[PDB]
Amino acid sequence: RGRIELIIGPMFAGKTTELMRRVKREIHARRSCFVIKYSKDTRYDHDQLMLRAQAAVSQLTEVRDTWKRFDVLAIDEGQFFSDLVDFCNTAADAGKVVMVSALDGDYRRKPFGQICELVPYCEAVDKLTAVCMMCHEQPACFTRRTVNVEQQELIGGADMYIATCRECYSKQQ
Amino acid sequence: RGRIELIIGPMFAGKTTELMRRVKREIHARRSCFVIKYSKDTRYDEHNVASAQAAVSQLTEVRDTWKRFDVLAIDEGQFFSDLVDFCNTAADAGKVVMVSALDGDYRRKPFGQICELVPYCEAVDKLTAVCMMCHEQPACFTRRTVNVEQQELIGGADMYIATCRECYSK
Amino acid sequence: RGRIELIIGPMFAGKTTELMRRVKREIHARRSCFVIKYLRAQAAVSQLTEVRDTWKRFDVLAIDEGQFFSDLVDFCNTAADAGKVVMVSALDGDYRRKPFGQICELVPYCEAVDKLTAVCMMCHEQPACFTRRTVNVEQQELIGGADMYIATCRECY
Amino acid sequence: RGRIELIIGPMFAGKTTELMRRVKREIHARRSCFVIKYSKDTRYDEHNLRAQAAVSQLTEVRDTWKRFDVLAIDEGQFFSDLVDFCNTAADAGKVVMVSALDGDYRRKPFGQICELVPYCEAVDKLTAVCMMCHEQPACFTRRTVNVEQQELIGGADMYIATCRECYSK
Ligand SMILES: Cc1cn([C@H]2C[C@H](O)[C@@H](COP(=O)(O)OP(=O)(O)OP(=O)(O)O)O2)c(=O)[nH]c1=O
Ligand SMILES: Cc1cn([C@H]2C[C@H](O)[C@@H](COP(=O)(O)OP(=O)(O)OP(=O)(O)O)O2)c(=O)[nH]c1=O
Ligand SMILES: Cc1cn([C@H]2C[C@H](O)[C@@H](COP(=O)(O)OP(=O)(O)OP(=O)(O)O)O2)c(=O)[nH]c1=O
Ligand SMILES: [Mg+2]
Ligand SMILES: [Mg+2]
Ligand SMILES: [Zn+2]
Ligand SMILES: [Zn+2]
Ligand SMILES: [Zn+2]
Ligand SMILES: [Zn+2]
């Protein structure tokens, strides 16, 4: 039946990649998927003859009942949706395969959005690791911010963030 | 090479088992381990070879003992209010910290500081039990069979059951 | 819902431990298990034919040290096809890294394969995926433990 | 820090996808990768450090791999010199990663893959979804055309991923 799967880890780990792997897997079995991304203007990646949908939204309420038609819900950048838990649950309880790719922690390692709160509801949690972009010789589980902004929500990539190991995360300069 | 590893899931999944598997693994490599378990009890530092097991209510009660050890294994981590800071301070010192815990309580709310610890972990494995209601599906939640509201209620099979999703609401 | 699950890795990785974890898991759900070594039953046997039809009564078959059983594949398959949860803990490779028994040959039939890692008992600071033999015996089958084998990483091997 | 990592499972499981996820990981850390694919009727190379070859036997890469941090070999099952090659490289300190079918359409060991397992520091088996019953994971590959040959290159028009029950139906 229905469930919630969570894909977490730092930036540069391939979480989104893994989310889509699972999506393509379901499509080959002719199961209908609805991919939900967050309103964050940044370049992405049609190739099947199945039922496949793709929304970009600020709050999951904005999808209304659209999801009911679908077998599989894939939510990327889940950390930015404030109604994540209730939404995934309501859907999973309806018998939907809900999959969520997210940062578990922000640049200061504080719980990012409702992600840590979602964990108790998940039938599976996979944490991916990046490679450390400072020492290049250890896996990376944290994300360090290279610009001087305090705000938690700051959309961006390699020019503003680096994936790091433990030692490296505290290295000052 | 220091780090935090987290082992979670519902009751009856073998988390503690897995914690100890990893402990024995380290011992075979002559690496020293300090196993920290939870309620109202002892300390030991014998079998102290050149060639430990504590039970406590708060991790402060271990003082600096851990500094001598290669590997820290903390079972039932959910009950320790100073978990995050403790595992971090240790991991940063270069210690292999491993934690077995319930990620969620009987109402599926975050249990203790476990969910808060996740961002600090280099690894997170969630184990699954078998559903003890329908016996034909894996189990990821813990249901409470007695009528107590309190979150902290220590106990086993007579007070809790591991369940799948459908069963959890039945 | 029948299947084969394989638990492999070198010595000192806790394979047997992991096999039993899964067993206890099933018992708590009141599912009947039959543990085969080389509600709960436990046999010790040289060839799996020696169990006859006993397994038919059971929900879950756990086979430890599977590498030593020459009839492993056909047995696990026949059972899994009957709807049994068959679980196998084994060394995938011997001390010279050659395929041990019918284990590598079983992989294509498995719904799951987990390889566990030990800690390297030479350098103490890297995971271990191979088993080195410390005594000078050539024979592949040599039963024993820490006095005759060590788990190692690549460099150390 | 050298090693061999194996990614196996049936068709339609995303093995190749997973191989490339790991590759992009390494690249972000400015680590040089050399992706080696299979091809029978044609051989090919391209460099500028990320490289991509297509070849019939891994000997055809000569010493090119020595310059690289990370070797990714897709469809490893078709290379008869796989074990010795991955080992030689891993022993040199290379991160060797291999995506492959562990078994063929009749579930017999495909190429040298099962023989490579004892040499691997990691083995992940991916699962597809069953394309017959659509409601169970899939760990085997069934062939839908009538060819006996083991080597038959192709996709969804010639193969389906299945669960256990379905594989015999
Ligand atoms: C589910 C739950 C457990 N508890 C208590 C009761 C148990 O003694 C303890 C859970 O510890 P566990 O170690 O999870 O118990 P277990 O042996 O069943 O699990 P495993 O085999 O995986 O180790 O916490 C609560 O206080 N509140 C709760 O909601
Ligand atoms: C390495 C090796 C072992 N053996 C035998 C000796 C052992 O008794 C047996 C391996 O048993 P294991 O149970 O693998 O050894 P272990 O108990 O140390 O590891 P774990 O707890 O992780 O299961 O196989 C061989 O015959 N040839 C070999 O090359
Ligand atoms: C099953 C099977 C495949 N093949 C060939 C056909 C395919 O081209 C190739 C399978 O490799 P894959 O890369 O595994 O096919 P895929 O891309 O569908 O799967 P994934 O997404 O997991 O990478 O091997 C055979 O020659 N014989 C066989 O029995
Ligand atoms: Mg326990
Ligand atoms: Mg492919
Ligand atoms: Zn680093
Ligand atoms: Zn159930
Ligand atoms: Zn070593
Ligand atoms: Zn099927």
Residue numbers in the entry:
A (entry chain F): 3 to 47, 54 to 181
B (entry chain E): 3 to 53, 61 to 179
C (entry chain H): 3 to 40, 59 to 177
D (entry chain G): 3 to 50, 59 to 179
How did the manuscript describe this experimental structure?
Thymidine kinase (TK) catalyses the transfer of the γ-phosphate of ATP to 2’-deoxythymidine (dThd) forming thymidine monophosphate (dTMP). The enzymes from Leishmania spp. are type II TKs with a ~100 amino acid C-terminal extension compared to those from other species.
The determination of the IC50 value for dTTP was performed at increasing dTTP concentrations using saturating concentrations of ATP (0.5 mM) and dThd (25 μM) and gave a value of 3.8 ± 0.07 μM and a positive Hill coefficient (h = 1.6). The LmTK–dTTP crystal has a well-resolved dTTP in the thymidine-binding site, the magnesium being coordinated by the phosphates, in all eight protomers in the asymmetric unit. The residues around the dTTP have essentially the same conformation as in the dThd complex, with the exception of E85 that is turned away from the 5’-oxygen of the ribose ring, no longer forming a hydrogen bond. In most chains of the LmTK structures this loop is also disordered. While in LmTK-dTTP it can be traced in two out of the eight chains, this is an artefact of crystallization as it forms an additional β-strand to the central β-sheet of a symmetry-related tetramer in the crystal lattice. LmTK forms closed tetramers in all three complexes, which explains the lack of density for the adenine in LmTK-dThd and its unexpected position in LmTK-AP5dT.
